[PDB]
Design a protein around this ligand. Sequence first.
Ligand SMILES: *P(=O)(O)OCC(C)(C)[C@H](O)C(=O)NCCC(=O)NCCSC(=O)CCCCCCCCCCCCC
Ligand code: SF4
Ligand code: SF4
Ligand code: SF4
Ligand code: SF4
Ligand code: FES
Ligand SMILES: [Zn+2]
Lengths: 41, 88, 711, 115, 49, 111, 154, 117
Amino acid sequence: EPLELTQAFRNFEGGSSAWDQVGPGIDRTPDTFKLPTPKPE
Amino acid sequence: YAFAKGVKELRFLFCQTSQHSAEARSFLNRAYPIMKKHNPTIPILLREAQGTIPRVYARYEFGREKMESLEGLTDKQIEETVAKLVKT
Amino acid sequence: AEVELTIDGKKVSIEAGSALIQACEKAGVVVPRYCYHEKLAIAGNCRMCLVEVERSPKPVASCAWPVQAGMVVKTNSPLTHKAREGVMEFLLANHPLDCPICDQGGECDLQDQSMRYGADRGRFHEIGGKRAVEDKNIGPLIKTSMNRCIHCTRCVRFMNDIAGAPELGSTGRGNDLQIGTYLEKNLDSELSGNVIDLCPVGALTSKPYAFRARPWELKRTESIDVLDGLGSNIRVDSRGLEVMRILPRLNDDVNEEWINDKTRFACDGLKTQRLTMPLVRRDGKFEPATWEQALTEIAHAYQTLAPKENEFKVIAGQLVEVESLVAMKDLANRLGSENLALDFPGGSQPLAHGVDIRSNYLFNSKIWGIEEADAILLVGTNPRHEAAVLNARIRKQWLRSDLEIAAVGQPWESTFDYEHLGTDLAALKNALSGPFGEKLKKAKRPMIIVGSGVTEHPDAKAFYETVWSFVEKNASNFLTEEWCGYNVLQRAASRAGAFEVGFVVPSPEVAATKPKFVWLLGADEFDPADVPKDAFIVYQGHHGDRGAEIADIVLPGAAYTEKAGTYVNTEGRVQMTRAATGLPGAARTDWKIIRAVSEFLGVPLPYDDVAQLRDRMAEISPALAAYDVVEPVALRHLSKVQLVDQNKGAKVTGEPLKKVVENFYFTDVISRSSPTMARCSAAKETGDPRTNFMAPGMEEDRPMGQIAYGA
Amino acid sequence: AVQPTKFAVTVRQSRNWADAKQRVIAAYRAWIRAAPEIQTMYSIPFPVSHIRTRIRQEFERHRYVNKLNVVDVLLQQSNADFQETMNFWRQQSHVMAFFKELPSNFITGFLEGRN
Amino acid sequence: QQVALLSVGSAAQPRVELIGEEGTKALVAAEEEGKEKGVAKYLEEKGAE
Amino acid sequence: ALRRYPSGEERCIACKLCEAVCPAQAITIEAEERADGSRRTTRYDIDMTKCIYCGFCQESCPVDAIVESPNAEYATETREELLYNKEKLLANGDKWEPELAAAIRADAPYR
Amino acid sequence: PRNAPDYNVPIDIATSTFTPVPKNVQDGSEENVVPAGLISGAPMELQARTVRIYKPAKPATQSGEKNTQLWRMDWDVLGKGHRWENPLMGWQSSADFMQGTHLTFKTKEDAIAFAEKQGYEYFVQEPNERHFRPKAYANNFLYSPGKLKHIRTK
Amino acid sequence: GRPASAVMQAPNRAEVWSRSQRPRSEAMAGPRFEQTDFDAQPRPWAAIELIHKQPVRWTHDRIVACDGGGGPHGHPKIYINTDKPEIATCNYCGLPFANEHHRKYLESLPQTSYPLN
Ligand SMILES: *P(=O)(O)OCC(C)(C)[C@H](O)C(=O)NCCC(=O)NCCSC(=O)CCCCCCCCCCCCC
Ligand code: SF4
Ligand code: SF4
Ligand code: SF4
Ligand code: SF4
Ligand code: FES
Ligand SMILES: [Zn+2]
């Protein structure tokens, strides 16, 4: 039969934070897999 | 020279832009004053929207309606185009 | 010019004289805030936006720091981490442990920025305890819990600057500084409920909403307010069957994050006096009918009456949408009627402005045009009771610029200053011939605003030619390449859209034909002379009110929180609602009712779906297919014909202009059925500042309280 | 490895439209050949003509497909549905769930509630 | 930028000096040559060594 | 069981935290301001055939209102008997309070 | 014929009394669009129902803007069957199987591409953008040569 | 709805105490209640009547602390201002407080919400 529900599923996903909680993190690439930097002068 | 008895409204759909030639705006610029003075009881709804192909509707009695495009017509050719609509 | 700085290592440009916090929202850099709001003056009080800046001994308030030539800003340094952690400790030290009993929980900036920027644990344990302050009575709408206040000053800035209500303030000093009114007095501002949303915390909350919902259990629907003519953008929060609250959402072109109290607090009238079943009048009583035995009873009556041309009459109300008017215009047209009336007084005769050129009846300078306006003339309108959030925009432009306002009509208590020039057309004629006309002439961006009350007046014929003649005389000021000085202000959501498709009486020949079959399409404020006693009355709508109680048959339609209907606001913006809930009981969609009866009456309408009708809509006016935008009137100068050429010899009576809004809280069926508006009116009648005035709660004279709300 | 079951067919892509053309005919033939055998396996009380009618309609709904990669997903589903049916893994309720034994007008739909 | 790391080395083990200016223009080329031709093409023209 | 303070006032204040944290959506709560202006529930239902008996709802309570009793013997003849309303849950607390208090006493320091 | 309700569309095991009449369904002949909804297994109701594609606006009650970052695709509420009250407990029943579902997309184009490929009807609204204006703390204290139009209170 | 155990909302209170509370007489009716023992049904006492039999805790301090008296067993600790000449109530448990500075005014009111003594 087509699906009817005595009580519909309540999605509380709209209660998710308006503020970002994790940020960007950190870079952990080792120097051996980064490009070189042009030294001054 | 008013309309024929039976035309219940006129409805022109044109655009502000030159995408379609300025002839409908040129005809309406001149026509709408005199074409409203001779028969004030009839609505000539001038409706425009970006990218609207020029076009005119005449609504007749008991709900019937006639449409004719105005695309490519000139300010004179558009005049007879409306003229056949309100003359009978 | 846009100067160039680097924020968090990334380069950003922004106009000089901007706040550094503003340069952060451009650079995609999140900065915590409590006191700072984009729409308010900078206060500098919270200390949550402190960031690191070079050559600066101490952290700078980013909200109050002017962007300099080449500054370098760190929003993520040990200085900023230490400041945000320490300021959170201060704001949470005397804050009450009331997160379970508070209505701001799950939607709190203080808990979301405490979780993101403060320590996980408090160090405050004093045996002396926290600060406690007493609660306050500021009217029937705003429940107070002032222990929660963090002293951000957002509501005092809003009440004093935005709303022009200088009764709220902060009395005291030190840790005992307390927001409130000194005297226990009601807040009298139609923009009052906006402090509830501005409040970072739940000290200033909604009395009608108290304890009923949590934010995570709420469905969020982006819709349009229909309770006035502005089309304010709203967010409708529903929990299943029931709408819970109405929030504003951002539209800087329309409402600017504000809604008025009637838009906000009348939603509780969407559940109270609803129509859910067809009723046929039998022996002076209303009995339930099946939809079939109601449309058949309608069809039989129409067949018996045999209405000729224009003895079928249709009157449309404030809340009707365009899918109904375009469907009703097609039904009446094929029945032989062009008699398509409007609910206001004078809505059953040809209108002073016509409907041929859209610039005749619109707010032609946009709502955004007031942002530049230098001179504004008001003709017969109270901008507070007609367009409350548009009235605020006038005040905002007035405080920050040399804007001059004068008005013609009934004097009103105003949030801005203006000159009263008179009350009638003779006064208006001197107004333009006198100093304010020269002020209107000499100004850039001049602005005449005609209210819909004028269109209701005896002399709208004469008023509308007088104004337009001034405009045409004064183009290159009024009618420039980029400006339109002519505005007509609509106070009902349905009326510009009605004008858009011709739903208007065309001629007095039509208006002089007495009807015997009258459909009231959501019409409830109809004049008693526009409805014959012996006509067969059909009422379609969603509320049992003045329209339903005089009809022979009632048909339950949808409300605006349960339909996807197009509305055109006073400036010609085309907006669509979104259904927040389903239809109650056995109600139908209104355009389907009209399409359904076209079967029974003998003339079925071609479309069977909303897209087919919206294709019909877009060839009545193609602007109705361009949503969220306002189309420019190409032939602007053609407005002379219906405004002047058609309005030349008018039997002017000299009767002064009226005040078309007697009661702001009661303007339509939804408001007249709202318990919350019933409390707003009653408190305003007697001045009771008490929060539980006709609401649950204990009082001194009410030891035991009451379950009744609104009584 | 483990043995593929009795009607297990390796999943392979159609080489060209001629390949797909011949496979679809092979699948339709194999279904209508098996309708007498489905009837007694599942104790269908209808006659086999109805069962073959339903097979025809299932194939007809994919009639107007002009994409090789959509046909091959479809040839996959029928292979698994055929293998599933012939090995008697599904039961009578599943096979009868496949036989159904919307309002026809706007006005009919309107009067009853939407449908 | 695996072709890049092969072209000029890495902050750990640089290949050539990249002294001051005129080394940056070589730095972008190492990344640009990686985006124009990949690893298989890179090993094709430098050969087997 | 729903529990009361030593004065007979309900401890439940309608924060809805347990309704949010439920992993099986077995709790449905409706609240209002009571006649005396108190934040109290009007509806309080637990679908005892949806519950997973994890204790997360009593973990989250700010005021120790919702608790799980030490009672396991409550098997019923029908499933309607397993749809507990506020009337059934308060009655459970009113009957089981001496153990609910002795369990909280014995287990509180570890919470 | 100009977006018409097709009353001969076949029904399947998932059609109920709340299934809308469809204007059209995919058949796999359409150009450049993968007919995913034809082979997905979803009922035909998914092609009779319009979705809304939009960026959620910031809540009025908060200043955080993380729920405004992305594009959301929802299913519109139908007139019947979205909610009704259970006779037994007063719980809110439903016959709309899409009421608790939503999809999230990085760009508007991705949302259109997915809805086109699934056979959804779809309406897009564009986000209302903030009008920028410089804000200066020193405006609070500007000199007034004439009448003070309001008395600022901080 | 024959017995009083099927009409009175609670044994200690007959009428409803919320705007939305369905009356007992309107919920004990129907086919599901036709062979039912009404007094065997859960019929708990109304907390609204009970809390208001508590007497006022009098105090001289401006600000009182209530944590529910249970220590960790009670409720989150809060603070109630007692400055208005009115009985101040704890928002969690409803216990009444008054300040002695209003003792003369409160003992003059024709009625009150909590026993002053
Ligand atoms: P002629 O040139 O007209 O060739 C006819 C065909 C059909 C080959 C077409 O011209 C054609 O090439 N069209 C595209 C291919 C096509 O029609 N469909 C792809 C084949 S797979 C398919 O259609 C699967 C259908 C459903 C599964 C099989 C049917 C049986 C289901 C169960 C029956 C009862 C079990 C209890
Ligand atoms: S405002 Fe309310 S929800 Fe937010 S922290 Fe304070 S008490 Fe808790
Ligand atoms: S009441 Fe709210 S908005 Fe006003 S100062 Fe206190 S926290 Fe700020
Ligand atoms: S968490 Fe406890 S106090 Fe809060 S609403 Fe649920 S049962 Fe009541
Ligand atoms: S113990 Fe039961 S009621 Fe409590 S959260 Fe778990 S499943 Fe829900
Ligand atoms: S936001 Fe700058 S100090 Fe409050
Ligand atoms: Zn307490």
